[PDB]
Amino acid sequence: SMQAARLAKALRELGQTGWYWGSMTVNEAKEKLKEAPEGTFLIRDSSHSDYLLTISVKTSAGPTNLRIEYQDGKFRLDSIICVKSKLKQFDSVVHLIDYYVQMCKDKRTGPEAPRNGTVHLYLTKPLYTSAPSLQHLCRLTINKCTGAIWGLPLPTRLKDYLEEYKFQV
Amino acid sequence: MYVKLISSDGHEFIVKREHALTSGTIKAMLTNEVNFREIPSHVLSKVCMYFTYKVRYTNSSTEIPEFPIAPEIALELLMAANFLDC
Amino acid sequence: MDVFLMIRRHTIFTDAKESSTVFELKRIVEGILKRPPDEQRLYKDDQLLDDGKTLGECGFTSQTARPQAPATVGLAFDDTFEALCIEPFSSPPELPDVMK
Ligand SMILES: Cc1cc(CNC(=O)[C@H](Cc2ccc(OP(=O)(O)O)cc2)NC(=O)Cc2ccc(F)cc2)ccc1F
């Protein structure tokens, strides 16, 4: 169906990120993030029955973990930290990430927590399992320049590769 | 052990043969030299920089830093990375 | 420790140790370029280097010459030594206005 297809598409781009860590534990995450600068994040499978993926991110207090929720074909941050209306929904978990990452990059959010209750997620640079493809490292670089890839002096085959992963992280 | 790679404006690059085999299209073709007649020098130098960045950081033991790509050569080097399959 | 460089002449990619001597570099160019170290001269920036010093004693760090951004070095090969001439690479074209 529309759900089933969009679901598998979500994991397929998750495999393209290079910062997906699959079956990882919290203690393995806490270790791999103990030395990273504040804001470094990774995505891994969740050890809870009702959750698939989970964000592990470093803060000045140390590594912490946030779960990602799936309900009727929509990804969103765990609904137990805030009212659902303040937690934006998404199709791809990567689009979820790219949104919360780009917000901090735009200085619309900072490393300090707001006092008015809204969701606070400080994300800077990802933590890669392996060096990505040079091709993918431009797809990222190009996407940080423009979102109108079909108006570029490129062969059509190259643009279709860009259209598979449109995010900036 | 070493391989020499030639660009369009003739710039010669010598890298470790292991560094060059990350590119899939080069691996199939292996004199110990290869001329790339479409890829200019400013693009050819960065692909070799990616080769080292790939070999050193294949393991996640060291924190993988970001690969800096200036937007001007991004268009060109994407076409080159598709040529070399890396 | 590791310090990644680019020997460029009229370009060689390699890595080295921060404790390696500058003479140890002239031995690596002898392997591929097939020229003796006595017929070799190095020139970081515009300055020659003593073969007894190390790369760190000449101003090379793992933070300055990472593999993704390797600090480059120059070489000048009859009677007298040649002059150090390195040709820059091509100029990247103008940015398409959409990406500007
Ligand atoms: C960033 C952020 C955080 C929160 C609240 N977060 C928690 O209180 C989580 C709860 C959790 C624990 C495991 C987990 O992993 P998993 O169950 O496998 O998905 C997922 C979530 N506690 C911890 O982090 C404590 C911890 C730290 C290091 C470790 F090594 C082990 C445990 C709210 C808003 C916000 F912006």
Residue numbers in the entry:
A (entry chain A): 30 to 198
B (entry chain C): 17 to 46, 57 to 112
C (entry chain B): 1 to 10, 13 to 79, 82 to 104
Task: Quote the study on this structure.
With the structure of 9 in hand, further optimization attempts focused towards engaging an attractive hydrophobic groove identified between His149 and Thr93 (named "HT" channel). It was hypothesized that this channel could be readily accessible by further modifications of the 4-fluorobenzylamino group, particularly meta-substitutions. We therefore next synthesized compounds 11, 12, 13, 14 by introducing methyl, ethyl or allyl group at position 3 of the benzylamine to form favorable hydrophobic interactions with the HT channel. To reveal the ligand binding modes, we solved crystal structures of SBC2 soaked with 11, 12 and 13.
The Src homology 2 (SH2) domain recognizes phosphotyrosine (pY) post translational modifications in partner proteins to trigger downstream signaling. Here, we use structure-based design to target the SH2 domain of the E3 ligase suppressor of cytokine signaling 2 (SOCS2). SOCS2 can tightly bind to adaptor subunits ElonginB/C and scaffold subunit Cullin 5 and RING domain protein Rbx2, to function as substrate receptor of Cullin 5 RING E3 ligase complex CRL5SOCS2. In this work, we describe the structure-guided design, using fragment-based growing, of a pY-based covalent small-molecule binder targeting the SOCS2-SH2 domain.
